[PDB]
Amino acid sequence: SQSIIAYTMSLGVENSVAYSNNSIAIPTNFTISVTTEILPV
Amino acid sequence: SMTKTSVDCTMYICGDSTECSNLLLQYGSFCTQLNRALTGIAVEQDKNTQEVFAQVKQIYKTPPIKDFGGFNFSQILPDPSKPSKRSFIEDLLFNKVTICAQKFNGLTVLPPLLTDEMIAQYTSALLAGTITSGWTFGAGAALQIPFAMQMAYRFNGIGVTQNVLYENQKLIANQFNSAIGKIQDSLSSTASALGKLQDVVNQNAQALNTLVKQLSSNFGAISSVLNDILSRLDPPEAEVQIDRLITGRLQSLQTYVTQQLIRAAEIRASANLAATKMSECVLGQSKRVDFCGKGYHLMSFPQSAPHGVVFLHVTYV
Amino acid sequence: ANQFNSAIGKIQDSLSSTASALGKLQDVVNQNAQALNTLVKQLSSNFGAISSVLNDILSRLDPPEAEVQIDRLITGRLQSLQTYVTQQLIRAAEIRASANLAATKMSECVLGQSKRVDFCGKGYHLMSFPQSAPHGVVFLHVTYVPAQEKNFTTAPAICHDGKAHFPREGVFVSNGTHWFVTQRNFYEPQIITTDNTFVSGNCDVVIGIVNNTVYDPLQPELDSFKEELDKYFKNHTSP
Amino acid sequence: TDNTFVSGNCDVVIGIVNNTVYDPLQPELDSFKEELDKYFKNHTSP
Incomplete structure (x- = not known):
């Protein structure tokens, strides 16, 4: 029941920013993230 | 980016000829390395376009209310009346x-993975996140901030105390709105204004025009046309003339x-400069001297352009 | 400490599980293998000569014809x-470019702390730890990423006595009944004081300014001395 | 005294100039001398 399908690519998940002239979002908690980046020398 | 070109050397050199094709097999990988080189260049064109424009994994959208503290972005933001x-x-x-003529001579141009609307959609997301949320959506979760409160931090970062914005906000908004009117007028008045991109379009046209014209070049043979050699000479003399055309x-x-x-290394270098300005001028504020235009950097507005990116840098002078 | 220790465990698992994880260095070995394989393979190519083997020319042709066929192989x-x-x-220009980027990330990411946006991983750069790899360098970038956002009501400035108070560090935020200053990279509320803010101009020029009472740490410190001052005079009226 | 900080004497700085540095606490203590002195002046009358 599997087959190769063709589709228009999604650019990312859609997200409208809740912008207002009297509201601000502030992070109440945080992530300390370790991210690998590899460069040839 | 620059025009993605795939050239099948099998048809370029030996266009519709089995006799020539059997002679090109004597040179081997020369045909292979040429196809691999142009395929690698084409693959890198989407890498360059994504490294510069695809810096956000969410499709950010602008609010229905445009209260940005008096700053008029209608000339840089999308226009829903347009297709x-x-x-x-x-x-x-x-x-x-x-x-x-190019496609007729074995020259094939490949479409970008991000279309002229998809590149403009990332530009719209970069504009919406920047104006409604500042740098925070690039470095983590998108944090909404009123744009006039965003500008105060911008001024603090360049050594201007936050009171200078709010005590002069009407003058600062008039200076930006008048300067954006001058951006529209300047770009609409001068034909050579995009000379940085016109050099990419002109380089691709001159290179592909040289590549097509060189099929008519004799290279010392009795004719540039493989069929005129094969129509006149036998298997002994025709191969001698065809080898001049193959070489x-x-x-x-x-x-x-x-x-x-x-030129791909020049486009890689320019896309890497555009990637670092997309992160540091658009997705942030740069304390780097003269990196996001002349003056003290407040912020930059990205705009898409043919084969490139245009930065509208806002600086305190 | 648990966040770093758990993230390093995830770097170990990711690097041990995915074969393409080091693809940026595997492309150096793969490019050199294809380049050197094409470089040797082309010695078997005729290039238009009667044979790819130089001895097959010399075994069959004299000093006149052998030189013509040998020049086909030399060309x-x-x-x-x-x-x-x-x-x-x-390719050496790509390796020079990537080594120059690695050299600037070594100096700014390992030897220091980088304020450059997205230069030392995604997030606010804390530190980077170097690890060597075949033909390259691996940077383990440690970044602070804001994760749990909460929406608050906010104001550009506070009005106290007809004078505009602006934040020193932070943003003005409301819990719904009270106002506090907090830093834009972590929600920690602080009392709106005369030390947390600075004064500039009247309360009419700031669009969206709000009214509240700004705490003066010197006010109870001198009011407690006003009652001592009054007891000092009362004591000296008695002798 | 809040806009500036102290470091060393007035002889070590080449080109230093004389001025009066305002102390925000000085008028706050001068008002305590004026209250004290007016309480004493009134207390001589009864």
Whole structure:
């Protein structure tokens, strides 16, 4: 029941920013993230 | 980016000829390395376009209410009445900078993975996140901030105390809105304004025009046309004349691919500069001296353009 | 400490589980393998000569014809090295560029802390730890990423006595009944004081300004001395 | 005294100039001398 399908690519998940002239979002908690980046020398 | 070109050397050198094709097999990988080189260049064109424009994994959208503290972004933001989400300044960018023979001579041009609307959609997301949320959506979760409160931090970062914005906000908004009117007028008035991108379009046209014209070049043979050699000479003399065309057409492909690899390094370098300005001028505020235009950097507004990116840098002078 | 220790456990698992994880260095070995394989394979190519083997020319042809066939192999093999070395100078420019980026990330990410946006991983750069790899360098970038956002009501400035108070560090935020200053990279509320803010101009020029009472740490410190001052005079009226 | 900080004497700085540095606490203590002195003046009358 599997087959190769063709589709228009999604650019990312859609997200409208809740912008207002009297509201601000502030992070109440945080992530300390370790991210690998590899460069040839 | 620059025009994605795939050239099948099998048809370029030995266009519709089995006799010639059997002679090109005597040179082997020369045909292979030429196809691999142009395929690698084409693959890197989507890498360059994504490294510069695809810096956000969410499709950010602008609010229905445009209360940005008096700052008028209507010339840089999308226009829903249009079939594509281009701004007034982006329509000037694509209108100021502007084929059959190429495809007929074995030259194939590949479409970008991000279309002219998809590149403009990432530009719209970069504009929406920047104006509604500042740098925070690039470095983590998108944090909403009123744009006039965003500008105060911008001024603090360049050594201007936050009171200078709010005590002069009407003058600062009038200076930006008047300067954006001058961006529209300047870009609509000068034909050579996008000369940085017109050099990419002109380089691709001159390179592909040299690559097509070189098929008519004799290279010392009795004719440039393989069918005129085969129509006049037998299997002994025709191969001697065709080898002149194989060597010369082969040199014309190596000349084209060498110029495309060297120009691909220029486009890689320019896309890397655009990637670092997209992060540091658009997705942030740069304390780097003269990196996001002349003056003390407040912020930059990205706009898409033919084969490139246009930065509208806002600086305190 | 648990966040770093758990994230390093995830770096170990990711690097041990995915074969393509080091693809940026595997492309160096793969490019050199394809380049050197094409460079040797082309010695078997005829280039238009009667044979790819130089001894097959010398075994069959005299001093007149053998020189013509040998020049076919010299020209083609010479084009093989010119194509190879051209591709090696073009690739060496990519290795120089990537080594210069790694050198600037070593100095700014390992030898220091980088304020450059997205130069030392995604997030606010804390530190980077170098690890060596075949033909390259691996940077383990540690970044602070804001994760749990909460929406608050906010104001550009506070009005106290007809004077505009602006934040020193932070933003003005409301819990719904009270106002506090907090830093834009972590929600920690602080009392709106005369030390947390600075004064500039009247309360009419700031669009969206709000009214509240700004705490003066010196006010109870001098009011407690006002009652001592009054007891000092009362004590000296008695003798 | 809040806009500036102290470091060393007035002889070590080449080109230093004389001025009066305002102390925000000085008028706050001068008002305590004026209250004290007016309480004493009134207390001589009864």
